[PDB]
Write a protein that binds this ligand. Structure first.
Ligand SMILES: *[B@@]1([O])OC2=C(C([O])=O)[C]=[C][C]=C2[C][C]1[N]C(=O)[C][C]1[C][C][C]([N][C][C][N])[C][C]1
Length: 261
């Protein structure tokens, strides 16, 4: 209850909409705040796309080594890795890492294309038992995050449950699950988000997202020191189209729901 109140307080101060789902695998409990509302996933959707490629690889040896051409026409709005490879190839492993660890958008588009498009990523989510996730478009338009628009959204509850399946459960084979977690633990974009609300000794694998309407997201698998793992989704979005990102709100939310663990 105290946690409920404190999240409400943080929401009020922030001026936006906050969605939180914590799963504590110590005792199979959850902390939920607007966990059944929809939020634009933005780049947090890249976990699902990388996982779909990993799943495909279980029946296609060496798929992760398959090369993909990067052409000027592939560049989009945010290309931190791909812009270094124009007019060469990158492997699907390389693209997965770039999508997950740098939030590269070309890399996401290549993962999307490889598996058959947004509807294929969505069908993979369904196959896992996630009936909430929907990836409707490609990069960069999937990040518009317009209030009231259900495209490219999920709920905090659904994303937490799916991320626990992917990272701690059996959605993926052991090699593929380890590769996903390795990639996420190597993320470079999350240090100001959930990470920033946890003790320094805790280990985190996370994926951030940023979008229109100051949308600021993070989904994480967390290994606290000497404790069973956690799954945490913190989604946040704002009323103004050009609102500035608020990674600090995610850090605050993470502190509130884990303080006292
Ligand atoms: B995606 O949501 O991930 C992402 C992040 C992130 O992980 O936090 C940061 C920067 C870019 C990206 C790529 C994806 N998002 C977008 O393509 C839209 C986003 C909108 C805000 C932009 N920065 C504006 C600063 N005035 C960057 C692109």
């Amino acid at each position: 209850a105290d946690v409920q109140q404190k999240l409400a307080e943080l929401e009020r101060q922030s001026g936006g909409r906050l969605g939180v789902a914590l799963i504590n695998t110590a005792d199979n409990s959850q902390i939920l705040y607007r966990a059944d509302e929809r939020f634009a996933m933005c780049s947090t959707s890249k976990v699902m796309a990388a996982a779909a490629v990993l799943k495909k690889s279980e029946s296609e040896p060496n798929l992760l080594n398959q090369r993909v051409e990067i052409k000027k026409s592939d560049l989009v709005n945010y290309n931190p890795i791909a812009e270094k490879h124009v007019n060469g190839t990158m492997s699907l492993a390389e693209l997965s890492a770039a999508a997950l660890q740098y939030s590269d958008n070309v890399a996401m588009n290549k993962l999307i294309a490889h598996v058959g498009g947004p509807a294929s990523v969505t069908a993979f989510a369904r196959q896992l038992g996630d009936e909430t996730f929907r990836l409707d478009r490609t990069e960069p338009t999937l990040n518009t995050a317009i209030p009231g628009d259900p495209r490219d959204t999920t709920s905090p509850r659904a994303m937490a449950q799916t991320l626990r399946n992917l990272t701690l459960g059996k959605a993926l084979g052991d090699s593929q699950r380890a590769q996903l977690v390795t990639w996420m633990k190597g993320n470079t974009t999350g240090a100001a988000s959930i990470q920033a609300g946890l003790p320094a000794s805790w280990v985190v694998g996370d994926k951030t997202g940023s979008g229109g309407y100051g949308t600021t997201n993070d989904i994480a698998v967390i290994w606290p020191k000497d404790r069973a793992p956690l799954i945490l989704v913190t989604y946040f979005t704002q009323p103004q189209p050009k609102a500035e990102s608020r990674r600090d709100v995610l850090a605050s939310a993470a502190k509130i729901v884990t303080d006292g663990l």
